[PDB]
From Swiss-Prot:
Protein name in UniProt: Mu-theraphotoxin-Cg1a
Domain of life, source organism: Eukaryota
Region of the whole protein represented: 51 to 85 of 87
Coiled coil: none
Described purpose of this protein according to its UniProt entry: Potent and selective inhibitor of hNav1.7/SCN9A (IC(50)=610 nM). Also shows a weak activity towards Nav1.3/SCN3A (IC(50)=7950 nM). In addition, inhibits voltage-gated potassium channels (Kv) in rat DRG neurons. It does not alter the voltage dependence of activation, but it causes a small hyperpolarizing shift in the steady-state inactivations of Nav1.7/SNC9A.
Compartment(s) of residence: Secreted
Miscellaneous comment in the UniProt entry for this protein: Negative results: does not inhibit TTX-resistant sodium currents on rat dorsal root ganglion (DRG) neurons. Has no activity on voltage-gated potassium channel Kv2.1/KCNB1 expressed in frog oocytes. Does not show activity towards Nav1.1/SCN1A, Nav1.2/SCN2A, Nav1.4/SCN4A, Nav1.5/SCN5A, Nav1.6/SCN8A, Nav1.8/SCN10A sodium channel.
Disulfide linkage: 2-16, 9-21, 15-29
Length: 35
């Protein structure tokens, strides 16, 4: 359905959830910052 931690974010919101989009290509979802 969506990408999880270290998947492939297309949105900085969280792709799946509780995440953010890495600004480093290739963009993968990481745990926001210090969540």
């Amino acid at each position: 359905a969506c990408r999880e931690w270290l998947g492939g974010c297309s949105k900085d919101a969280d792709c799946c959830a509780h995440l953010e989009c890495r600004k480093k290509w290739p963009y993968h979802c990481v745990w926001d910052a210090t969540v």
